[PDB]
Design a protein around this nucleic acid. Structure first.
Length: 123
RNA sequence: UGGUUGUCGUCAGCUCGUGUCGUGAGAUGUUGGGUUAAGUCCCGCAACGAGCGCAACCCUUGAUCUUAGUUGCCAGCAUUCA
């Protein structure tokens, strides 16, 4: 089964891309046509690719994989947090701090710090 | 040479851990928008923190309460050259 129907994708506006002047030639594989100066994403391949992504995530999640939802874009900040909270996963919705993954030890110390201040406030 | 001192200069600066960028020396952080006496503080930001500086902690002066009332003080009380 298609994890998402083309009707839902159309209502969600998945077919809307960016302006022709901002197009990436590598994205040509996923573009269906151009209309009114805006590129339209090929929803037929979109359905197939979304189905693969959902299955991959489910396999990875069943192996205990931790998925981090990242979106600082103003339109996405709220959605990322709400959906991550529902799934019990982590999110970065305000600003990605450089070194969050490559310098994980340094971030953990700051994470530890926050928890200490919380305990001082509660106690 | 040790120890000590002058000097830039009581100027607001000088660095480091990890990360990232650069073939490399390096850079970033520490730049930028406001603000400050100040790298002082806020915000932004491939940076995230830390340290020596800055400020504060110390001394003195300016107000006042408590304790203490002599060798200090004399208002109310008499007396003295005081």
């Amino acid at each position: 089964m298609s994890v998402i129907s083309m009707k839902q994708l159309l209502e969600a506006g998945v077919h809307f891309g960016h302006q022709t002047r901002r197009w990436n030639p590598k994205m040509k594989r996923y573009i269906f046509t151009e209309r009114n100066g805006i590129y339209i994403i090929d929803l037929q391949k979109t359905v197939k690719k979304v189905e693969e992504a959902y299955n991959f995530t489910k396999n990875l999640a069943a192996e205990g994989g931790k998925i981090l939802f990242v979106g600082t874009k103003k339109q996405a900040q709220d959605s990322v947090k709400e959906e991550a909270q529902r799934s019990g996963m982590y999110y970065v919705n305000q600003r990605w701090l450089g070194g969050t993954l490559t310098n994980f030890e340094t971030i953990q110390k700051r994470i530890k710090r926050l928890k200490d201040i919380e305990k001082m406030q509660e106690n």
